[PDB]
Design a protein around this ligand. Structure first.
Ligand SMILES: CC(C)N(c1ccc(Oc2ccccc2)cc1C(=O)O)C(=O)[C@H]1CC[C@H](C)CC1
Ligand SMILES: [Mg+2]
Length: 559
């Protein structure tokens, strides 16, 4: 069937949409070519709609069924709990889209009589009505990028706040613990960036002759079929579940996840969906399970040998035992055909990679640098173009989510996050006298509130003290960063070094936590290095819930 059907009504915005970067005195010091920076708007929605709309092809074989049963057996060990309204509400982000039933984010978290009473009625309804298609709103997502030698906005389909709270009640526990139980070490969201690298590097070394590749599925969400979603429900159903939760999953599956009507911001019937919705609680879990299933089965059809998968939603990377250049290329092609039959055709054709640093998964790649002692140290990085374009935009305008803070946390050891983002933002935060202020950001889709002053500890716990001393990066990483700077018009190292030394001095004079950031974060900038000993606060940090599972589109907030 058709991934989508359209009525003609347009996907409309719900206010004014900024497309260009504001000429700002502060954004200009970070990036000079402001015209290369842009944000998607509903004005490009038509272009997107045509790309995600198509008839899906699907043929299932014995390999698929086999892997499916393997997966179900493991799911069979699971015991999901079911959250009470109270907890599900606690999980709602303070700034999440309001409900059309008289209440909003704040009321939900505050457990207002009106919000809880409505939520209750939606839950009862999910228990009584097993059919009626649940209404969703479709919107053009606004995201920032740098022009290329432009991207049309992405679309998001999400149900009402009321319905979202119920999804949590019935599936929060499931989507937080079933992926790991079913896929084990292949589930990428259980790893912190450093743990992801270690898993990738060790996996790579465990091969006599390693061969690896990333697989890009062309619009993965639209390739998800009604069948894949029921197969996915079948996996969830192997769990021990409270009666009400079992019915909630059954009804939410037929009424929401397999598809339903599309309404715009004006309240107009836009069309219908018969593929994955991007703004539902099961999206990450669902996509990860389905990609792993098709991929694993695809590997068997292709005869790839000793495959180790690493899956994060629709993002996939496979590392296996080489069989030779020609044989690897043939196997890879066979893999792609198997995936195509399973309704997961490629966007970018896949290519075998014999160099670990050249494999990009989760928009990132593993690379290597050196610590003070001089020992090689592997770490996660990525092309900084987008991270930087967005740092510029968030500098010029107020945004709910600060990706820059999220990028500093996840890529702390990188040459670009240290030299550019830390310097730029600590300089700016000192000025505005807002170093104490907590900011929201996302990690694997879950929303968190973090104090910039804590970055030193956070970085030590997740990356180790070496994140403050890495130097001598790879020639490949250096060219990528440098050619990035030229493109966006970012000041060179010298300028940044001067700024960092000036910010570092200012941070050291304040003492307390600010001096902590001064000493650690900017030690790369001075010549007279300061001995960097373990930060006490790093040994008393609970950062486990940070890397448990994916939540993108889940409307998840970790208090
Ligand atoms: C060796 C030495 C001088 N050096 C480098 C300076 C420039 C560079 O590569 C470029 C080139 C152009 C633009 C940006 C970086 C790479 C390195 C390195 O450590 O290998 C450093 O000490 C870095 C160490 C990390 C900080 C955070 C910035 C300076
Ligand atoms: Mg893709």
């Amino acid at each position: 069937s058709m991934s989508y059907t359209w009525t003609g009504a347009l996907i409309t915005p719900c206010a004014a949409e900024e497309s260009k970067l504001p000429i700002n005195p502060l954004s200009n010091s970070l990036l000079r070519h402001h015209n290369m920076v842009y944000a998607t708007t509903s004005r490009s929605a038509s272009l997107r709609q045509k790309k995600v709309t198509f008839d899906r092809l699907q043929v299932l074989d014995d390999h698929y069924r086999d892997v499916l049963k393997e997966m179900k057996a493991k799911a069979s060990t699971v015991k999901a709990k079911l959250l009470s309204i109270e907890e599900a509400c606690k999980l709602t982000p303070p700034h999440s889209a309001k409900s059309k039933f008289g209440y909003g984010a704040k009321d939900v978290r505050n457990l207002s009589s009106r919000a809880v009473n409505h939520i209750r009625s939606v839950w009862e309804d999910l228990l009584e009505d097993t059919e009626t298609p649940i209404d969703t709103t479709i919107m053009a997502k606004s995201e920032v990028f740098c022009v290329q030698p432009r991207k049309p906005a992405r679309l998001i389909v999400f149900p009402d706040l009321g319905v979202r709270v119920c999804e949590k009640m019935a599936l929060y526990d499931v989507v937080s613990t079933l992926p790991q139980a079913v896929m084990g070490s292949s589930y990428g969201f259980q790893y912190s960036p450093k743990q992801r690298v270690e898993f990738l590097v060790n996996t790579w070394k465990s091969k006599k002759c390693p061969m690896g590749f990333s697989y890009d599925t062309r619009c993965f969400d639209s390739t998800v079929t009604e069948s894949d979603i029921r197969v996915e429900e079948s996996i969830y159903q192997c769990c021990d579940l409270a009666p009400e939760a079992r019915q909630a999953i059954r009804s939410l599956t037929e009424r929401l996840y397999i598809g339903g009507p599309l309404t715009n911001s004006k309240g107009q019937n836009c069309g219908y969906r018969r593929c994955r919705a991007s703004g539902v609680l099961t999206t990450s879990c669902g996509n990860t399970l389905t990609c792993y299933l098709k991929a694993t089965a695809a590997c068997r059809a292709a005869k790839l040998q000793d495959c180790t998968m690493l899956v994060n939603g629709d993002d996939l990377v496979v590392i296996c035992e080489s069989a030779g250049t020609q044989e690897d290329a043939a196997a890879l092609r066979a893999f792609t055909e198997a995936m195509t039959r399973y309704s997961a055709p490629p966007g970018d054709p896949p290519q075998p990679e014999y160099d670990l640093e050249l494999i990009t998964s989760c928009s990132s790649n593993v690379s290597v640098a050196h610590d003070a002692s001089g020992k090689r140290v592997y770490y996660l990085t990525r092309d900084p173009t987008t991270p930087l374009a967005r740092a510029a935009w968030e500098t010029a305008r107020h945004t709910p989510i600060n990706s820059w803070l999220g990028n500093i946390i996840m890529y702390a050891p990188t040459l670009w996050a240290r030299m550019i983002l830390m310097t730029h933002f600590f300089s700016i935060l000192l000025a505005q006298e807002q170093l104490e202020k907590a900011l929201d950001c996302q990690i694997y889709g879950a929303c968190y509130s973090i104090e910039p002053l804590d970055l030193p500890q956070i970085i030590e716990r997740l990356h180790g003290l070496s994140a403050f001393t890495l130097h001598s990066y790879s020639p490949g990483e250096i060219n990528r960063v440098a050619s990035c700077l030229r493109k966006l018009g970012v000041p060179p190292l010298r300028t940044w070094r001067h700024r960092a030394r000036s910010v570092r001095a200012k941070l050291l004079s304040q003492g307390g936590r600010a001096a902590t950031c001064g000493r650690y974060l900017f030690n790369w900038a001075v010549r007279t290095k300061l001995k960097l000993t373990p930060i006490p606060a790093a040994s008393q940090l609970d950062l486990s819930g940070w890397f448990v599972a994916g939540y993108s589109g889940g409307d998840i907030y970790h208090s």
